[PDB]
Amino acid sequence: KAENIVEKAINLLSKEDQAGVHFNEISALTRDFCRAILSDLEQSGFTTSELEKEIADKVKIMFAQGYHIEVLQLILEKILDSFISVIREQYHDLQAAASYITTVRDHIFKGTSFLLKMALQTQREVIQKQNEALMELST
Amino acid sequence: KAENIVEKAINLLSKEDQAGVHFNEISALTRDFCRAILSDLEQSGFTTSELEKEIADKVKIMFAQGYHIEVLQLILEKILDSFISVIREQYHDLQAAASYITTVRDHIFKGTSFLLKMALQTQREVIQKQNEALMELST
């Protein structure tokens, strides 16, 4: 459990284009995300809130640091894979495994949806900023 | 099959916030997307190309028309639901149904990933345009 996901996710990400982002930051992000989605999962009543928090925050950070935000999507994707992999190992009951994997896939897909919204909102805010700058400054 | 998905998707979308977009356009988009993903599905060797085409094009259109691009994600999501619904009806063999639904879910998730990339690329291009405008014009 736990880190066994993280080190797996990280491993997959080791094989992927990092979009300029330093690998230690990549790893940290992976850890924050896994931590968040696990906090959400252990919950009763299906909470998406923690992962959402991490995502919003990290969108902010990413944009401030000037890195392509898509790199988060990738991370999520790999995390998903990681879970699947681990759950294929640890759970020999195919029904239980199927259910856990289904709920994880749910959480993740909703997470990437939220991620899309956030990234777009942010970039729009900036585009507007620059727009007002442009016009009210063409005086 | 076919339109039975579309009218279902549209129906779901009838219940959702359209983000300012006229409903006839919503419907058209739903149709283009269903058509594309079906063209991809009937293929052998797992092609994502057609849906990708539709997505890129529609990102362009959406941005030019000044509508929030997230509205495409929603459409995709509902389309997914539609398939599931239909496949729960038409296929009484749970194995076959499970497999078809799994491959559709694959196609769609990859589609939303691509959508994220595209939307971000576009908005970035604009942000940069405005940026050069800003600086080379602060002369």
Rounded CA-CA distance B73/B131 in Å is 28
Return the SS3 of A72.
Answer: helix
Q: Do A120 and B77 count as a contact with CB atoms less than 8 A apart?
A: no
Return the SS3 of A31.
Answer: helix
Rounded CA-CA distance B133/B139 in Å is 10
Rounded CA-CA distance A63/A70 in Å is 11
Q: Do B113 and A109 count as a contact with CB atoms less than 8 A apart?
A: no
- DSSP letter string, A75-107: HHHHHHHHHHHHHHHH---HHHHHHHHHHHHHH
Q: How many CB atoms lie within 10 A of CB B98?
A: 13
Which of A74, A92, A60, A95 minimizes the C-alpha distance to A30? Answer: A74
Question: The tokens 């991490």 sit on which residue?
Answer: A54
B127 touches chain A (CB under 8 A): yes
Please give, rounded to a whole number of angstroms, the shortest distance from the CA of B3 to a CA of chain A.
26
Which of B69, B138, B114, B97 minimizes the C-alpha distance to A138? Answer: B138
Rounded CA-CA distance B117/B56 in Å is 10
Whether the Cβ atoms of residue B23 and residue B9 lie closer than 8 Å to each other: no
Query: Chain centroid to CA B103: how far?
Result: 16
Whether the Cβ atoms of residue A86 and residue A68 lie closer than 8 Å to each other: no
Name the residue facing A130 among B73, B116, B130 (closest C-beta). Answer: B130
Angle CA B117–A79–A126, to nearest 5 = 35
Whether the Cβ atoms of residue A119 and residue A42 lie closer than 8 Å to each other: no
A69 touches chain B (CB under 8 A): yes
Rounded CA-CA distance B52/B47 in Å is 10
Rounded CA-CA distance A139/B76 in Å is 43
Whether the Cβ atoms of residue A52 and residue A76 lie closer than 8 Å to each other: no
Residues in chain B: 139
Name the residue facing B73 among A116, A133, A134 (closest C-beta). Answer: A116
Whether the Cβ atoms of residue A59 and residue A75 lie closer than 8 Å to each other: no
Resolution in A: 2.7
B46 touches chain A (CB under 8 A): no
- In terms of DSSP H, where are the helices of chain B? 3-14, 23-41, 49-65, 70-90, 94-136
Domains and CATH numbers, chain B: 1-139 (1.10.490.130)
Whether the Cβ atoms of residue A17 and residue B117 lie closer than 8 Å to each other: no
Question: Which tokens in the block code for residue A49?
Answer: 């809130």
Please give, rounded to a whole number of angstroms, the shortest distance from the CA of B110 to a CA of chain A.
10
Q: Do B77 and A113 count as a contact with CB atoms less than 8 A apart?
A: yes
| Residues of B with Cβ-Cβ distance to A116 under 8 angstroms | 70, 73, 112, 115-116, 119
A99 touches chain B (CB under 8 A): no
Rounded CA-CA distance B43/B56 in Å is 20
Question: Which tokens in the block code for residue B67?
Answer: 């509508």
For this PDB entry, the determination method is X-ray
A102 touches chain B (CB under 8 A): no
